[PDB]
Amino acid sequence: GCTLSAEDKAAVERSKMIDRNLREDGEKAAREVKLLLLGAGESGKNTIVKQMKITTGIVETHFTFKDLHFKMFDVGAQRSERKKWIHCFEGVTAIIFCVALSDYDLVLAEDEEMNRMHASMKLFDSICNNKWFTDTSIILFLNKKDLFEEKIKKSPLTICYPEYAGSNTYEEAAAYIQCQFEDLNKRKDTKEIYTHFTCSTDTKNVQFVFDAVTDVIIKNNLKDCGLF
Amino acid sequence: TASIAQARKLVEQLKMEANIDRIKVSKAAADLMAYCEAHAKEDPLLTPVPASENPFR
Amino acid sequence: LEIDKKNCCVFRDDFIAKVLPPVLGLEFIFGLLGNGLALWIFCFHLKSWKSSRIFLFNLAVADFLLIICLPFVMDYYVRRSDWKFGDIPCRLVLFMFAMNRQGSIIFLTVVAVDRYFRVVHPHHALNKISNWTAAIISCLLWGITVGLTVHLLKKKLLIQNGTANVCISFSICHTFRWHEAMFLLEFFLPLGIILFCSARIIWSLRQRQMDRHAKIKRAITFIMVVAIVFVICFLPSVVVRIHIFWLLHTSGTQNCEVYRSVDLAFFITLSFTYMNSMLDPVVYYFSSPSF
């Protein structure tokens, strides 16, 4: 400082101003909630995002609720290998997963024999047991229940699940599907799975997301302080 | 219909990548060794540099 | 004789040497071991430092100092009298006990308040607070503790009762000195704050479900554990002080024969305030899954 010239002093003050700006940007960005949105082609991600907000690549949606700033990252356009970029999202508050439970009898357009629900279960198994998401909470959304109620009356669930043994009532079938999904969680000690049944007019999904995020943040604070 | 076209493309690639001049391994190894030993004195990490001409003191 | 006018009798009892020194030495050994091992773990075995760890560090330091300055009073009881050391290392020790105990109480309250803000208000700016501000808060708290304790340093604390010299601060006298007021005050208000924070934590965490994880269930008990530990460690002393004040008001400073039993009980219960310093690493430092 004392021996520095004028040019060195100018460089030092420029560096100090840059550091101040970097610190303020980091502090501002540390108070937001980051969410990763996953699903399939017709899971119903767009329908959820429709009431959430109220070039391929990655598209980001920002919305505010109860003085919290959220940020969703949809990565459905990326058709490359998932293992080469999935570690960039290590450190998100939670993962939102969308499943269309009205597609138990429909089949994939690409491959006829494989069911859509089985593919969704395989994707959920891969994501949930990933080594980069050992202790990341998952919010599970089951989307098309309005069509599920109609399609379960005239069709049996045994098509997708031949080992199903129960009545074809909507409640029992939905509960069975929920237990089938929650059974794939092989940690049960580091992460929690939140399941919600929604429709095209539920208009209360943001409150559920807020509650799950609050629980996750409380758990993080308790882990930081020493308890839990 | 395009499968035969892609197969022809692959055959073309293997055709005009299999006709080149390939030297022996010994000559390439000798050239690498000669280049490494020719610039040995110019490498500032192979040999420790005096602190007089070290910008990172 | 007399202690700066204000005619008030002081008592010496031989019963202390029979009971206290062994228990007090065991408490000192346990506290020293716990504090030393905790300091060794925190100072070098850990790298990630947060606000909670910073606030716990000062409590550990205060407990360590309180345990360290104790053999001086071991000597006071084994030799039973005369405070052989001198005069300055009497004001010094009566300063370094009161300051250490008040710091321990203050840092316990601060830890409880931090937990309450972490649980009840998860989205708050106080939760995301820099280590620099934590250091400023710690320095301010230490300064407040020292400023409140320094009252005893600029005075004289010797009595010279006949052939025996007593190094005491709790002198039974019809006076409203700041020492007794501080002793009464530093219990009830922190007790209320701790109880309020604990009740809010338990209620808010219970109504919000969160019982499946079972580490939440493990940690929901430690709050009440530390609350009851504080209660049992700091209730008898203030109870005996209240009884002493009542007896002094209802009987005056004359007839110096009833105060014997209550003074003996007060000196028995004053050793309870050193019991928390050895349990503090157990229920605050080794009771966490962090290490």
Added chain:
Amino acid sequence: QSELDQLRQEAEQLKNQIRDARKACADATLSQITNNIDPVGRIQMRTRRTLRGHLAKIYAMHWGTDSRLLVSASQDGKLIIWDSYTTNKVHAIPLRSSWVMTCAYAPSGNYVACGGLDNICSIYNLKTREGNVRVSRELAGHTGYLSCCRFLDDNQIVTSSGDTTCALWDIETGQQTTTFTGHTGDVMSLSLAPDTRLFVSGACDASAKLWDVREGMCRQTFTGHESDINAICFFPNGNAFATGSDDATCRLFDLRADQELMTYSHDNIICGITSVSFSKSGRLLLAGYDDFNCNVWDALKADRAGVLAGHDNRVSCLGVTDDGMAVATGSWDSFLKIWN
């Protein structure tokens, strides 16, 4: 499908002929030829500088041609240019998309480039009329994430992407002049030759290819690895290149002999290589690993001549200056360290 079967048989015969020619040209091995070479002394470098300021993981870095300035990219949406001599920060460019995966420095020192999951290669102007930095171009022709980019001139740039293609661009126009479509897997790295007439790339198909910039055709194909290729570097002479993969091995290939020459592996190492680089004379091969530290290899004897261990997380990038004075390493713990 008889014609398809006979075509497959012809391709198999061609592959067998190529393999037989490669075997025939292998008269000896480099390791036994280099037997009478004095082993390099145990290299021991020290952390001369430590650059702080990034608040998230660091994914890429690149040295300037003056061997004094460097640029680094982080997932907090920042592109910082550092002065390596005095640690001072010269610029701090904010990015529209924070998911950056690579960055580059122009040889003239006038531009920097970066890209990531947005599939865009953004180009910034460093020397402008004012004291600020503004976006100069945005190349938007790729359909997958962009993984590497290198400058040929102030008006040309070569990029690689996750759509199994590499492309050559024109900054002032903005269109893909040439496209390279040989690969069948995601391309993760590329390296230009010193004369900027050739470049090599390594993809997820465990193979590397050599391309001609002017023509647009693959000349040679190199195999031998067992898993993903994460980094590639090109020998200072210009007739060889080194490849680092996920099977905890590094290999050296010769362009003129057109086959693998020598491999660098150790039994204790089980983690993958994230970055490789050569020294000025080409004697030392520096490689970054997943086990949080860098290893220095002897390029002629495959002997570990040193270890660079100063990082708490994965080492994601490293580079050696043009004059060979220092080597810088970046890591996921958000720190840059300069060794010497």
